Amino acid sequence: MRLYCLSGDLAKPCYIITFKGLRIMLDCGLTEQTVLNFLPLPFVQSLKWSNLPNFVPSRDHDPQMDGELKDCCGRVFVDSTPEFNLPMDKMLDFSEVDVILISNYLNMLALPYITENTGFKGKVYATEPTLQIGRFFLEELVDYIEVSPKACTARLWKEKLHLLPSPLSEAFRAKKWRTIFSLKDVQGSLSKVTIMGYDEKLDILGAFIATPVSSGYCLGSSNWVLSTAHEKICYVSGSSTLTTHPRPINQSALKHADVLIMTGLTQAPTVNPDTKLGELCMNVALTIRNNGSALIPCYPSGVVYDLFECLTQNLENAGLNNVPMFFISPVADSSLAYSNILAEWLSSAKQNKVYLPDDPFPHAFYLRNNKLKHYNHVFSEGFSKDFRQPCVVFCGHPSLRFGDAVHFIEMWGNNPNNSIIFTEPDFPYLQVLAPFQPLAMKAFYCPIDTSLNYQQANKLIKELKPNVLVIPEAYTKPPNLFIEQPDKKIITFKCGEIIRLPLKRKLDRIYITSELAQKISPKEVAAGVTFSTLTGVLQVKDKVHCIQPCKEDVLKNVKYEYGSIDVDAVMKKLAQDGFSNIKLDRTGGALTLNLVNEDTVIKFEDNETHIICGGKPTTRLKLRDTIMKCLQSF
Amino acid sequence: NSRELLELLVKITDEISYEDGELKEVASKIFQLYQLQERDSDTSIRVKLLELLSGLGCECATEQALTMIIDYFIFLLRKEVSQKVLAQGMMCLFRIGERRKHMLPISYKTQVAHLAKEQLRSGSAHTQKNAMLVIGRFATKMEGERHYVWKLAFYIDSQDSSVRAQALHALLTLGERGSQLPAVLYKRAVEAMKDDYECVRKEALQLVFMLGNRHPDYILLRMIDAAFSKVCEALCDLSLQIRVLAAELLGGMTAVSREFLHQTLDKKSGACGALIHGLEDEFLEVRTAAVASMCKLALSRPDFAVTSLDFLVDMFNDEIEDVRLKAIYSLTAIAKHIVLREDQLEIMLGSLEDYSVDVREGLHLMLGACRTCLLMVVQKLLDVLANSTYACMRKIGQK
Amino acid sequence: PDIKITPLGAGQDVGRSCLLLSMGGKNIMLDCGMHMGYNDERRFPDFSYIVPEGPITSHIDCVIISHFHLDHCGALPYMSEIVGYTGPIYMTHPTKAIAPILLEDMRKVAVERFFTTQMIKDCMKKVIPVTLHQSMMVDTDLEIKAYYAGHVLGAAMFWIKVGSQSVVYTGDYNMTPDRHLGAAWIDKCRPDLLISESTYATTIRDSKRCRERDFLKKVHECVAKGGKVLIPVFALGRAQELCILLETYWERMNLKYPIYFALEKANTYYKMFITWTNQKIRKTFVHRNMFDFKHIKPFDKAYIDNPGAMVVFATPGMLHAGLSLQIFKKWAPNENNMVIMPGYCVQGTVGNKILGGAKKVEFENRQVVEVKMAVEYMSFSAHADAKGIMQLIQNCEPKNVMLVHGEAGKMKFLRSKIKDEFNLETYMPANGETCVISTPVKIPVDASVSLLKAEARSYNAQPPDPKRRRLIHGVLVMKDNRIMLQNLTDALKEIGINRHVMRFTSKVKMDDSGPVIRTSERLKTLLEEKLAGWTVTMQENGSIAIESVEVKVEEDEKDPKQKNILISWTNQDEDIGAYILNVLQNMC
Ligand SMILES: O=P(O)(O)O[C@H]1[C@H](OP(=O)(O)O)[C@@H](OP(=O)(O)O)[C@H](OP(=O)(O)O)[C@@H](OP(=O)(O)O)[C@H]1OP(=O)(O)O
Ligand SMILES: [Zn+2]
Ligand SMILES: [Zn+2]
């Protein structure tokens, strides 16, 4: 089997494997980190992003590239729409692909780029929460970019990168960056997805069985197992071992894979998420106490469900009450309503709260009071009535380049008592707020990420014990933060490599009927193994063979001859049958038999017995049975 | 060293641009680099070089560079032995073909079709599928008719679902752009609707539709009543896509009958309740298609439009916006064979109280075109206002 | 192997459903239920057939509950704590959420006129819930899978597999959708047996709109004359659809009569489990939730003797043991008011007598009532009719059919139709008697991929005509408990034993004067004409070959007019090395 690597971003995989004439894509994800090279996209905004100084890169310039790059008093930014990065499209044609398997919603956001205007005709498989929450994320990216749009008019920097300074001079590809897909592309793409559940065992075109096996990381996040009766491929992406609200990790069913592909680690591995949650609560309580506000840029359905609960508990245990929270996102009502539908996908502590008819997530309670409110946008009607300060605002995009959050950075920026906390490791925080640098606001950066630091991943792999371990190159690379398994072999793929994994099929599962099974005649040939000869008529009809019993006149009678005969068997048993005139030419390496009833000769070699001279038909048969009675047969 | 060449090939094909003279030299260098490759080397290098040549010929615009690159493909694939490279070469020829479709001389089309046909026997179920794809685009009329219809029709009984589906799809593609598909193919398409895989049932249903539409008066009992019944039975399919497609197809076979068409709404041999079953579907995309197909079937036939009034009036009180809009527009378009009535106007006018401004506009347009009962329309329209109503008031007065 | 089924309930009858399925060394209990028509010992299934006088935990491997209706889950705490069972019980999450409520209500109405609250709590602590299409691996060599059935919230059809034998049990299912609860869906899994319910085996019900129009028209006509309507339902189940459509109709026609539901956390369970409803509720549940009504009011007892006009949804269905029977007693000796029976009345209940045409109802302690009210049976029970049964048969494609939840004559009619249409064998065992079904063996083999590839290469030389045959052949080797289809060379190499070949050539003399090349060409022509079914190749050394036979010439025929011909064949093709030589002896 091959493994095509299509993604140079460690956080967002995209792989293709070929298992049995089938090409299977694993986790088509979107690199959102390339949006930090561009300027922020505000809703309606003053002359701050206007009248910015141009950048001239100290060498030969062009009349056209001026105005494309502007500086923000230390750094250079492109004045254009965000232009996300995606898997490479020419290592394979996306129409060769027959099946796409999706693990998380976060590893999902580049699906409309693959499935819609290419020649793709296959199936897409995911769990129900991944499809729904990925629908939320895709709709929210389209919404944020289309609320206050800009124009893609900044191509000329892409052709020349050695001129430009440090941060964007290492742009990965930058010529295959695409701006955004549209809403009907989302509808058409998600119409091709078909719901699966944990441990479903679905047959894929007769070639293998696919099964998602509940990596305890997100709502509906899964690891994938492809199985035949003799092979087993396991793909591991999300994988949290700590205890939290999703259904915990099922490492039972990853246990004996022939190939184990491992993708997603913490991206902040020297960090305990619980003490960072505690630092979040400490910092937000301290800025509330100082008559300031708090803005937490976040995804619409990620760890915000835990942020609400832990925030309320620590704030009310800190002697603070009546502190409002606002969830502002164009999918926030949909997310908050849909989150209470998924009791079957939760951990035991929250799942048990629906047998007694209660809401598994606490934030529904916060909506029956007025502690938590939610609005589509900051400009939505009713927000200006209910807005109070001090407050904690859970808002739009963590990148701060589009969404509601940009507005808040303009409004709360210059008061020193306000504070940002960034909780997403996918976005370096000092890069994120780079064009806001006359800030005077606090900007604390407490990173929460519950997904397998290296010390847990080593334990997981040496507990799983796969035959083969296929990982990125950056993992086996040095505080000893690297995967080492000295007792097994590790294969290693970089960004654009076709790697040719070592898995060879040697067996295949077929069936026989009862009659032909009865016709079998075992013969003991060695200590604990017997032989038999089989013949029949085959009826495959998909890949499920079946051997029915029966140029078929002579073929279904064949046996095979082992046990080369010794010297004192043929002539000793041919003398007394009725023909006792055997002439034996016993040459120094062979035997020769001449006989008088008719001209015939029997030549014996230590590995071969044969005749030369024949005659009338009955002359053959005495030689036939005399040789056959004392020579071993199946 | 082989790995380094593969890495260079991947980087080049990622960064290349075939749109933007030297084509002979680079084509010959690709040919020579293909030649040196030993057997039991990496086949991915050969695949990369073939797809490089393929894109480079997909953007040619010279009418002789295309033929030179096609000749390179023919020469390289006629001696190829590995099935992976052969299937990829078939796909490359397929991409060249559909990108141009107008620029290859007919001799070259015949040669490419013959080359694809020669791989049908020794193929590895991927080469066979891609070869039938190339046969589908490259076979012309009068040679698909005499040789390729039977050759592909044999592969409907193939052991693999992909190969069966591709055989049916290639027969459909030949049938589209001119070819006489015989009526004896019909029995082969019906039996292909019992396949365990949706990708084969889909093309089989397409082929049944096509065969019943162009041989409408064949016997064995009129070959479009049989096709109508067979597509009616596909409204109970196990897959949603085939069910949606059957509901869409059912309205396109206009020349069916009276006695068979009138069975669909006359509930209780496969058509006896089909449109009623499709209108009471749980899936939105099936209900909408059933409404549209019933509208198409009733547009020409007056009596069916009379009997198809109560069902489409029923679809007014559906709690999905799109099904409501489809029913309203279908009643607007049908509104020449029908006389409205008080009991129907009850359910019909109960829907004048919608929050969104799509339903009220379309339903005004419906009442304008449509024909004691005059009071209740005026009684209900006056409430909603207390532009669209005035224009609807202008038209209802004129008739 | 055999599949044996004994029904402890729902055999040529309805209610008290319970089946015992045994195949492959396992025993499975399907739907432990109870009887509404009776309250003596035969109210509950007779668990003495499994093992008399003791806990059954060693003789049942799993229990499986389809849905929360009491004729299918009613005896669950009785089975779990009275007789005893300390194993796993499998059902869907809504069934585990809702069965305690129905059981507690039925225990309230039963103890007054038996298990307790505590044993309901303890029986629900043994339940392991299961999701849709999850292959729940019960102890090795036993597999369970749940399918959507419709007909109540969380109902399932179950697929049970033990060692290449599979059974589908439908429970109760509806093949047509309704307001909530989309249709039943099964795939083409081809079970060896399909156990199906046949409550409506002889009917083809009209349509959605005819039934809804009849119900709404009757309700409106009765209530607009000052009359009162009683609807006996259960607290959760089919009542929600009637509430939805009545509230829709009374929002549409804007009526102002009162409508009450006589019970209060029932609708929050429908709110928690929106993923088990149909598409149009999952689409609209965020903004317009259909499970709060703002026309249905809570009901009070003092409203029974009011003089107005109302519609009352009462708490026990079938009018058997509670408030519905009280309101029916109060409103029965009056004209211009009615009761609407929306489901199936298990015989022995009051509603069965009412629907049978009886005008005299005799109660306890000599109470006689004349039912002057209108009695209108209608079908909102959401069961599968004859068309739905035939469609399920066609969808899943079983080898056998079995009918349980229905009446005997309707089963016989549907069995005749099944044999006429599908040519299948349909069984219908009575209560207490076992049916046994036979199934082939089908032992599997681990063949070699190279052998199959070689056979497929040989076959793929002509187009795939299904009328010709394939001729796979190899060596069958088994070492421990593993059977392997290998080639001769591979198997002999693995075992270490070498191979002996016996190699047979012979001299045939014929009369010719020309060169031996002409003789060889004549032989080739004659063999091709007489056999015409074997590959004959003339190797350019002047040597003939047929697939294992080579034919040569000795000594270059020193004497003219004499030809000596070597016919050389192995034992493995002895027939084609012998008979054809006789052809020579029939021509020379
Ligand atoms: O000789 P085959 O029976 O056709 O085996 C092929 C072949 O494997 P090998 O030739 O290395 O044994 C393919 O490799 P190529 O040489 O054609 O590149 C390989 O394709 P991958 O490169 O994707 O591994 C394919 O395996 P797959 O099942 O992934 O298509 C595998 O077929 P089988 O392993 O099924 O026999
Ligand atoms: Zn039921
Ligand atoms: Zn029942």
Q: Write out chain A residues lying below 8 Å of B161, CB-based.
A: 205-206, 542
Angle between helices B240-250 and B198-214 (to 10 degrees): 10
Q: How many other CB atoms are found less than 10 A from the CB of residue C433?
A: 10
How far is C247 from C243, CA to CA, in rounded Å?
A: 6
Residue C453 marked ligand-binding: yes
How far is A27 from A6, CA to CA, in rounded Å?
A: 11
- DSSP assignments along B76-121, one per residue: HHHS---HHHHHHHHHHHHHHHHHHSSSS-HHHHHHHHHHHHHHHH
A450: Cα separation from own chain's centroid? 18
The nearest alpha carbon in chain B to C459 belongs to B121
Burial annotation A624-633 (CB, 10 A radius, 16+ → b, else e): eebbeeebee
How far is B314 from B331, CA to CA, in rounded Å?
A: 11
Sheet arrangement for strand A23-26: A3-5, A15-18, A23-26, A99-101, A123-127, A193-196
Residue from C130, C445, C549 whose CB has the most chain A CBs within 10 Å, to mutate: C445
Q: Which of A275, A272, A269, A302 is nearest to A457 (CA)?
A: A269
Q: How many other CB atoms are found less than 10 A from the CB of residue C106?
A: 21
Between the CA of residue C422 and those of C184, C232, C391, C397, C481, what are the distances in Å? 21, 39, 11, 9, 39
Looking at CA atoms only, how far is residue C111 from chain A in angstroms?
Answer: 24
> For the CA atoms of A341, A343, A347, A349, what is the dihedral angle to 10 degrees?
110
Which of C112, C197, C247, C494 is catalytic? The answer is C197
Q: Which of B111, B112, B189 is nearest to B149 (CA)?
A: B189
Residue A97 is encoded by which pair of tokens? 């692909």
3-state secondary structure labels for all residues of A506-571: CEEEEEECHHHHHCCCCEECCCCCEEEEEECEECCCCCCCCEECCCCCCHHHCCCEECCCCCCCHH
Which residue segment(s) compose the domain that A338 sits in? 273-433
**Ligand 1 lined by B125 (C-beta under 6 Å):** no
Q: 3-state DSSP call for residue C369? A: strand
C36 secondary structure, DSSP code: S
CB B292 within 8 A of CB B251: yes
Q: Both ends of chain B: CA-CA distance in Å?
A: 85
Those residues whose C-beta lies under 8 Å from the C-beta of residue A286, and which sit 6 or more positions away, are: none
Residue from B238, B347, B351 whose CB has the most chain C CBs within 10 Å, to mutate: B238
Task: Tell me the β-bridge partners of B67.
Answer: none
Helix (H) or strand (E) holding A314: helix A304-317
Q: Which of C178, C217, C189 is nearest to C383 (CA)?
A: C178
Residue C397 is encoded by which pair of tokens? 């494609």
Apex CA C485: angle with CA C483 and CA C486, to 5°? 125
How far is A389 from A418, CA to CA, in rounded Å?
A: 11
How far is C357 from A512, CA to CA, in rounded Å?
A: 60
Q: 3-state DSSP call for residue A126? A: strand
Pairing of strands A193-196, A123-127: parallel
How far is C181 from C281, CA to CA, in rounded Å?
A: 9
> For the CA atoms of C104, C106, C108, C110, what is the dihedral angle to 10 degrees?
-140
**Ligand 1 lined by C453 (C-beta under 6 Å):** yes
Q: Which of C388, C389, C405, C381 is nearest to C178 (CA)?
A: C381
Sign for the pseudo-dihedral over CA of A124, A129, A133, A135: positive
CA atoms within 13 A on the CB side of B16: 22
Helix (H) or strand (E) holding A328: strand A325-328
The answer to whether the CB atoms of B161 and A90 lie below 8 A apart is no
How far is C544 from C161, CA to CA, in rounded Å?
A: 57
Q: What is the largest CA-CA distance in chain A?
A: 124
How far is A473 from C458, CA to CA, in rounded Å?
A: 44
**Ligand 1 lined by A501 (C-beta under 6 Å):** no
Interface contact C101, partner A, CB < 8 A: no
Active site residue C197: yes
Q: Identify the burial level of A407 via C-beta atoms within 10 angstroms of its C-beta, where 0-12 means exposed, 13-18 middle and 19 or more buried.
A: buried
- DSSP assignments along C217-251, one per residue: HHHHHHHTTT--EEEE--SSSTHHHHHHHHHHHHH
Atom of ligand 1 nearest to the CA of C449: 36
How far is B16 from B11, CA to CA, in rounded Å?
A: 8
Which residue type sits at C417?
A: K
Matching residue, tokens 């006989």: A595
CB C89 within 8 A of CB C126: yes
Q: Which of B66, B106, B67, B69 is nearest to B89 (CA)?
A: B69
Sheet arrangement for strand C296-298: C296-298, C259-261, C311-314, C229-232, C338-341, C374-377
Find residues 61-120 of chain A whose CB sits inside 8 Å of chain B: 88, 90-91, 93, 96
**Ligand 1 lined by B80 (C-beta under 6 Å):** no
Query: Who among C188, C280, C464 is closest to B196 (CB)?
Result: C188
CB C355 within 8 A of CB C343: no
Q: For domain C208-377, give its CATH number from 3.90.1180.10, 1.10.8.640, 3.40.50.10890, 3.40.630.10.
A: 3.40.50.10890
Which residue type sits at B362?
A: G
Pairing of strands C62-64, C26-30: parallel
CB B93 within 8 A of CB B106: no
Residue B100 is encoded by which pair of tokens? 């141009």
Q: Which of B308, B313, B237 is nearest to B270 (CA)?
A: B237
Sheet arrangement for strand C435-438: C127-130, C89-92, C62-64, C26-30, C18-23, C2-9, C435-438
Q: Identify the burial level of A148 via C-beta atoms within 10 angstroms of its C-beta, where 0-12 means exposed, 13-18 middle and 19 or more buried.
A: middle
Phi-psi region of B2 (alpha: psi -120 to 50; beta: other; left: phi over 0): alpha
CB A561 within 8 A of CB A631: yes
- DSSP assignments along B142-188, one per residue: TTIIIIIHHHHHGGGG-SSHHHHHHHHHHHHHHHHTS----TTHHHH
- Check chain C for breaks (C–N over 2.5 Å) and list the residue before each, or none: 113, 263
For the domain that residue A297 is a member of, what is the CATH number? 3.40.50.10890
The answer to whether the CB atoms of A540 and B197 lie below 8 A apart is no
**Ligand 1 lined by A436 (C-beta under 6 Å):** no
Residue B152 is encoded by which pair of tokens? 């592909």
How far is C348 from C35, CA to CA, in rounded Å?
A: 9
Task: Tell me the β-bridge partners of A125.
Answer: A101, A194
How far is A351 from C346, CA to CA, in rounded Å?
A: 36
Between the CA of residue C486 and those of A359, A399, C234, C449, C494, what are the distances in Å? 60, 60, 63, 9, 10
How far is B373 from C532, CA to CA, in rounded Å?
A: 86
CB C124 within 8 A of CB C68: no
A447 secondary structure, DSSP code: -
CB B249 within 8 A of CB B205: yes
Q: Which of C249, C210, C234, C222 is nearest to C376 (CA)?
A: C222
B357 secondary structure, DSSP code: T
Residue C269 is encoded by which pair of tokens? 């369970």
Burial annotation B18-55 (CB, 10 A radius, 16+ → b, else e): eeeeebeeebeebeeebeebeeeebbbbbbbbbbbbbb
Q: Write out chain B residues lying below 8 Å of C183, CB-based.
A: 282
Residue B96 is encoded by which pair of tokens? 């060249």
> For the CA atoms of A430, A432, A433, A434, what is the dihedral angle to 10 degrees?
70
How far is C545 from C552, CA to CA, in rounded Å?
A: 9
